[PDB]
C-alpha cells in the first residue's frame, strides 16, 4: 500500500488526522522506534484493541499482558506512568474491565501528542513523504 499525497499532509494539521489514519500510524511508528519509544503507540494500540472485548475473562486474558508487556518491570521496556496513574491501574487490574488502563492510556497519548509528534513533524521523512511529484506534461 502507499498513502496519497493528501493523505500525508492531513497528519500536520493535527495529531487526532494522523492517529486516525491506517497509513500514519505506522509512519509514525516507524519514526517512534527510530526514538526509542515506539512502545508507547505499541500500548495505546494495545488499549484500544482492549475495548473491543465484552467477555470479561477474555479482558482479563488480554489485560495481564498489556500490564506485562508495557507497565510492568518483565516489560523490554515499560511506559512512562506516574505513581498515581500506576496505583490506579494496580488496583483496577484486580478485576480487569475495558477501562483498566484509561488513566495511562491517555498519558501516554498526550505523551506522543506533546513530546514525539512535534518531532515527527520537523523530521526529514515527514518532510520528505510531503513533497509533491514532478507532473510531467
Ligand atoms: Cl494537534
Ligand atoms: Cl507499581
Ligand atoms: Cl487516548
Ligand atoms: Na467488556
Redesign the pocket.
Given at each position: 500500500s502507499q498513502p496519497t499525497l493528501e493523505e500525508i499532509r492531513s497528519w500536520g494539521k493535527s495529531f487526532d488526522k494522523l492517529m486516525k489514519s491506517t497509513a500514519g500510524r505506522k509512519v509514525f511508528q516507524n519514526f517512534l522506534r527510530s526514538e526509542f519509544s515506539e512502545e508507547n503507540i505499541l500500548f495505546?494500540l494495545a488499549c484500544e484493541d482492549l475495548k473491543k472485548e465484552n467477555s470479561p475473562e477474555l479482558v482479563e486474558e488480554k489485560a495481564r499482558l498489556i500490564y506485562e508487556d508495557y507497565i510492568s518491570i518483565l516489560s523490554p521496556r515499560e511506559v512512562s506512568l506516574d505513581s498515581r496513574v500506576r496505583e490506579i491501574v494496580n488496583r483496577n487490574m484486580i478485576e480487569p474491565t475495558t477501562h483498566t488502563f484509561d488513566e495511562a492510556?491517555?498519558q501516554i497519548?498526550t505523551l506522543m501528542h506533546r513530546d514525539s509528534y512535534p518531532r515527527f513533524l520537523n523530521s526529514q521523512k515527514f518532510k520528505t513523504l510531503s513533497r509533491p511529484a514532478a507532473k510531467l506534461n
Open positions: 495505546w492510556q491517555i497519548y
